[PDB]
Amino acid sequence: MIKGINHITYSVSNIAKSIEFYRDILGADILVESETLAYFNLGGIWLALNEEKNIPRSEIKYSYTHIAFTISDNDFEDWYNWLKENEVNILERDKKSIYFTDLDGHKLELHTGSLEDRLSYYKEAKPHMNFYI
Amino acid sequence: MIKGINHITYSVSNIAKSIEFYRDILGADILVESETLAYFNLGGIWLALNEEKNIPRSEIKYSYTHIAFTISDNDFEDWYNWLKENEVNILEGRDRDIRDKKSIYFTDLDGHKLELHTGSLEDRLSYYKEAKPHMNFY
Ligand SMILES: C[C@@H]1O[C@@H]1P(=O)(O)O
Ligand SMILES: C[C@@H]1O[C@@H]1P(=O)(O)O
Numbered sequence A: 001m002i003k004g005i006n007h008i009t010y011s012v013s014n015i016a017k018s019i020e021f022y023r024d025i026l027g028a029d030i031l032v033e034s035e036t037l038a039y040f041n042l043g044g045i046w047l048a049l050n051e052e053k054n055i056p057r058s059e060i061k062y063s064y065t066h067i068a069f070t071i072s073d074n075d076f077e078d079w080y081n082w083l084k085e086n087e088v089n090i091l092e093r094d095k096k097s098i099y100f101t102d103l104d105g106h107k108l109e110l111h112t113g114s115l116e117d118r119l120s121y122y123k124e125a126k127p128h129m130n131f132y133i
Numbered sequence B: 001m002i003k004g005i006n007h008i009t010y011s012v013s014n015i016a017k018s019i020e021f022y023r024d025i026l027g028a029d030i031l032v033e034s035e036t037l038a039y040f041n042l043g044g045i046w047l048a049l050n051e052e053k054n055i056p057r058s059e060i061k062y063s064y065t066h067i068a069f070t071i072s073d074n075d076f077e078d079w080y081n082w083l084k085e086n087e088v089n090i091l092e093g094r095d096r097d098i099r100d101k102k103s104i105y106f107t108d109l110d111g112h113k114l115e116l117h118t119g120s121l122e123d124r125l126s127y128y129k130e131a132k133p134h135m136n137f138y
């Protein structure tokens, strides 16, 4: 049986610059680094970067695939301004969300809502969906 | 401050067969379904599938980007055998020292890379501190 999330690994083109992004902009706590890998604690999640210099990274911009992290409604504005302050690549009852990318186009989200919030909205607005809970 | 993981969302080309993959092979608990999306509990994580037509998905098999989920050492052979039984696209792992703990790498129907891993971050840091002198610790 799958017991929980273990780790998130991102392929990056420049470990040095990507480390700066995750550490200095998202506040990830660096644990180890070499020339080709870095590990972080980001919101209690084991984050790993592995440098891959020469792989194709053209198609990633087309996919809605992403990982959302939790922030407070209280820190929403503060995050938005900090990301804007840092020339971060921000993308344009659902609750609030900021979408952005790291340096290699990996889509990330800061979200203030819960699974319960989203289920309740869908029960009200979209009762034509199938609900199992 | 980032408080923790909120959800993981995959873009899928055929949501019907991606639902069967996550539900019937990985044992994700399905919560919601429409023609365009599906929500699961997988290992206490909010997992979302979003159907997207005509996105190019050929480059993804070249990237090491992936998400790893925890299984028990006790369940490792049963997981492996189960993914084999269901003709899952199991990938050739990297080379593995005993201290790296154990892993099964595979993809879903859209080539997203997944890992079943039996170790902790603590185990890896412990392995690397003893075996990896080209590494910096903090
Ligand atoms: C720790 C980073 O995911 C990689 P591994 O699967 O090569 O250990
Ligand atoms: C629910 C899955 O995250 C997607 P959303 O960002 O479209 O809400």
Ligand SMILES: [Mn+2]
Pocket: A066, A068, A109, B007, B009
């Ligand atoms: Mn999202």
Ligand SMILES: [Mn+2]
Pocket: A007, A009, B066, B068, B115
């Ligand atoms: Mn891994």
